Amino acid sequence: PVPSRARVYTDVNTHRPSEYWDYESHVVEWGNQDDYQLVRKLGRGKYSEVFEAINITNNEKVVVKILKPVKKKKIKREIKILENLRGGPNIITLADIVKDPVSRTPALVFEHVNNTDFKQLYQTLTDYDIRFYMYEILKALDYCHSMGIMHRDVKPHNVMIDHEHRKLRLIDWGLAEFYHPGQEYNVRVASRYFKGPELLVDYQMYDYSLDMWSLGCMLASMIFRKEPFFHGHDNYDQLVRIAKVLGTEDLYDYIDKYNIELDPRFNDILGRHSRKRWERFVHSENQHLVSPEALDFLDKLLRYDHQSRLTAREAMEHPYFYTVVK
């Protein structure tokens, strides 16, 4: 395959001191674990467990994430990314790092986020709230991309919103990575329904624009009230579901452009499909969420060619957000 490079924030990391991105060399500053009282486990992932907790020194509600004793490399990567992004718009705030006595591993403490006030993005929102919260997610993505970081796991479960106060956080930076031009990355990132075509066709030289495809998948599910929008039964069927919408000729042009050697299974299952107009997904019960601006925006995110997709900053300038107070 031919190389690719991000068209924005291309060499951010190249120009930084090595300490910025060389997470393996990072030295952890430890707090005191007994400042935190675990209240209940909220969830369990492949690499962590998350808990509702209280900082008993000040009665503050916090979220604690105990990192499973997997590859230490991944632990330092998440910590370094969270410290580099700390204070950025809508980025979850890492307040402390303590050693859990039971797991014997680092436990990350997050402040200004709690399970009572903030909830995962599982709500059915109005047109205005979709635009408002999508703009808040874009502020987080433009910030992390501008800091040379790709999130690689954008999905509803990684967006926390306090609806009463209209606050949002982009969470779970466990799959995030530093972008370096020319670097090959693992394609086993993101949840199936949110995987970009680059991951499905095994193109490793991807970049920040992967997060923009995932965002487009979220948007399409919200405006069309179809969860998930691209509902593949496995990774092979996931690309067929995308191709039934966007067509196979632009997919094959994308594969041709980057000289991707396609898995032969895809040539057997893809067949030939033409692009559908978005109005094919509009019906009486979602038409109130659809506008010409929403369709144009969706169209500019959901493009096979990762270099052609809107970037997070270009998305912030799009007409879909003109109505959002900024």
Author numbering: 4 to 329
Copy the relevant paper text:
The flexibility of the αD loop in CK2α has been noted before, and presumably this allows the pocket to open and the fragment to bind, forcing the helix from its typical position and creating the new binding site. Indeed, we observed that the loop is significantly more flexible than previously described.
